[PDB]
C-alpha cells in the first residue's frame, strides 16, 4: 500500500511534535494579577502579615 502507506506514517510523527509544543509552551505560568496599584499593598501587607489581629 506503499504510496499512501509511507506518507500516512509521517503524518503520525507530526502530531506527536504538536502535542509536545502544548507542553513546552505551558512551561511559563506566571499568571498572578494584582497590577500596578498593589505594589503599594505589599509594604502595608508585611505589617498585617506579622499582625496577630488577623
Amino acid at each position: 500500500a506503499a504510496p499512501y502507506a509511507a506518507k500516512l506514517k509521517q503524518t503520525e510523527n507530526d502530531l506527536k511534535d504538536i502535542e509536545a509544543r502544548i507542553k513546552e509552551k505551558a512551561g511559563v505560568k506566571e499568571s498572578d494579577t494584582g497590577l500596578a496599584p498593589s505594589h503599594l499593598w505589599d509594604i502595608m501587607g508585611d505589617r498585617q502579615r506579622l499582625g496577630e489581629e488577623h
Binding site: A26, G27, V28, K29, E30
Partner: protein, 51 residues
C-alpha cells in the same frame, strides 16, 4: 566500627518532623505544584532541586 557508627547517623533519620503523602492535582510553572495532602488540605507549595 561498621556496626556502631551506622546507628548514630540513623538517629537523625528516625527523629524526622514527619512527612506526608500528597498527590499533585496540577502544576504551576513557577516551580510550585498544587499538592493535595491526601487526608489533609490542598497546598500550592515549592519543590526541591531534586525534582
Amino acid at each position: 566500627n561498621d556496626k556502631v557508627r551506622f546507628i548514630k547517623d540513623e538517629l537523625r533519620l528516625l527523629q524526622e518532623p514527619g512527612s506526608y503523602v500528597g498527590e499533585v492535582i496540577k502544576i504551576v510553572s513557577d516551580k510550585k505544584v498544587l499538592v493535595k495532602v491526601q487526608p489533609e488540605g490542598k497546598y500550592i507549595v515549592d519543590v526541591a532541586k531534586d525534582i
